[PDB]
From a paper:
Dihydrofolate reductase (DHFR) is a key enzyme that is essential for the synthesis of purines, thymidylic acids and some amino acids. DHFR catalyzes the reduction of 7,8-dihydrofolate to 5,6,7,8-tetrahydrofolate using NADPH as a cofactor and plays an influential role in folate (FOL) management in many species. The M20 loop of ecDHFR can adopt three conformations (open, closed and occluded). We determined the structure of ecDHFR in complex with FOL and NADP+ under pressures varying between 0.1 and 800 MPa.
Numbering used by the authors: 1 to 159
């Protein structure tokens, strides 16, 4: 099973040239909880902004170019990224935009965080059709002293 995890602002914005203008540690705890002990597949731009290997996960980085950090696994295509995951119950694709686009048609589950923030971004989560997906879990949270904006966690499973 392939899943995608992402945090989207309005208009499905997931990235901009500069750091996102929000602080959502609860969302990062959710990302950690849902990715721990699973392989995570990411694109090279996302690798760079994470800055280190994610602990307790097998880190697979897609890049057309030779790898530059022997602590993680580098692959040059989607089929190779999947093959590097081995025989696991769930592969987590953690972005970014170009990677989500390529894995969305393969995915059976989406873990999405919807952030009540309007930002201009250069990178979007792909268009998905609500009717293709069944919302199996959703949990809204208000902003609070640690989290700058309200946000809602949702898990969708492919119909
Ligand atoms: N809010 C969120 O949930 C979230 C999640 C993840 C990322 N992001 C954000 O999204 C942005 C990054 O998105 P992006 O679309 O720019 O970058 P990305 O998808 O992270 O990385 C793209 C790079 O990955 C490699 N790649 C992708 N598909 C490949 C394939 N089939 N074969 C070989 N290499 C492949 C290429 O690396 P080479 O260039 O080395 O060939 C390509 O330049 C940032 O702003 C980041 O912080 C947000
Ligand atoms: N829901 C969601 N929110 C995100 O911010 C997000 N970010 C990415 C890509 N970027 C990142 C950036 C940093 C970390 C990170 O540092 N995570 C740590 C800290 C978790 C915590 O603070 O509790 C980790 O161990 O997962 C992960 C992914 C992919 N999917 C996401 N999904």
């Amino acid at each position: 099973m392939i899943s995608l995890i992402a945090a989207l602002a309005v208009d499905r914005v997931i990235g901009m040239e500069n750091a996102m203008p929000w602080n959502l540690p609860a969302d990062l705890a959710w990302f950690k909880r849902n990715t721990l002990n699973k392989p995570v597949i990411m694109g090279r731009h996302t690798w760079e902004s994470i800055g280190r290997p994610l602990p307790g996960r097998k880190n697979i980085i897609l890049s057309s170019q030779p790898g530059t950090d022997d602590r993680v696994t580098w692959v040059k295509s989607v089929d190779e990224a999947i093959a590097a995951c081995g025989d696991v119950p769930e592969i987590m694709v953690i972005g970014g935009g170009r990677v989500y686009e390529q894995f969305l048609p393969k995915a059976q589950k989406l873990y999405l965080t919807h952030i009540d923030a309007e930002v201009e971004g250069d990178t979007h989560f792909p268009d998905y059709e609500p009717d293709d997906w069944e919302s199996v879990f959703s949990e809204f949270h208000d902003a609070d002293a640690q989290n700058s904006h309200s946000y809602c966690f949702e898990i969708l499973e492919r119909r």
